[PDB]
C-alpha cells in the first residue's frame, strides 16, 4: 500500500502526519511563524508610509543597462529603513529628501521586481498626493 496507514483507527497518525508535512509548505510556515509580523519592513500591513532619506540611482541588472532612480525611506511606524523605486519617467523630480512618501509592495510576494536589485517596494504618494496625479497633471504638490 506504500506508506499511509489505511486502517480505520489511524486518524490520529493521519492528522499528526499531515500536521507535520504542512511545514514544508512555504505559506503555511510563513503564516504560523508570523513572519509577516516578525520580519519584513511593513508590519504585514498593506502599505506603509515613511520619510525620504536619500535619492539613489540603482544600477539595473543584466542583460539590461539602466539607472533605476529609487528613494531610501524610513518607515514611520518602524524606523526600519527601506529602499523603494519611483515608477514612471520623471517622478524622481517629484520627491525630495525629507518628503513624506507612502510605499506599497511590488506584487511579487516580497521578492524584488525587475532588473531592480534589492527593491521590494514602490512609491505611491508623496506629500499626501499620489505620484500618478502629479505625473499626469491632475494635482499639484502641496506648498511645504
Amino acid at each position: 500500500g506504500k506508506g499511509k496507514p489505511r486502517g480505520l483507527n489511524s486518524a490520529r497518525k493521519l492528522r499528526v502526519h499531515r500536521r507535520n508535512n504542512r511545514w514544508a509548505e512555504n505559506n503555511y510556515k510563513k503564516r504560523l511563524l508570523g513572519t509577516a509580523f516578525k520580519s519584513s519592513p511593513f508590519g504585514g500591513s498593506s502599505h506603509a508610509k515613511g520619510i525620504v532619506l536619500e535619492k539613489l540611482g540603482i544600477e539595473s541588472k543584466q542583460p539590461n543597462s539602466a539607472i533605476r532612480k529609487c528613494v531610501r525611506v524610513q518607515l514611520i511606524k518602524n524606523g526600519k529603513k527601506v529602499t523603494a523605486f519611483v515608477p514612471n519617467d520623471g517622478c524622481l523630480n517629484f520627491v525630495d529628501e525629507n518628503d513624506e512618501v507612502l510605499l506599497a509592495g511590488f506584487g511579487r510576494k516580497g521578492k524584488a521586481k525587475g532588473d531592480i536589485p534589492g527593491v521590494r517596494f514602490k512609491v505611491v504618494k508623496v506629500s499626501g498626493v499620489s505620484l500618478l496625479a502629479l505625473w499626469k497633471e491632475k494635482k499639484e504638490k502641496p506648498r511645504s
Binding site: I58, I67, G90, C91, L92
Partner: peptide, 12 residues
C-alpha cells in the same frame, strides 16, 4: 552593484 549613479536625466 552601483547604487549612487547619476540622477541628472530623470524625466529626460
Amino acid at each position: 552593484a552601483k547604487v549612487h549613479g547619476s540622477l541628472a536625466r530623470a524625466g529626460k
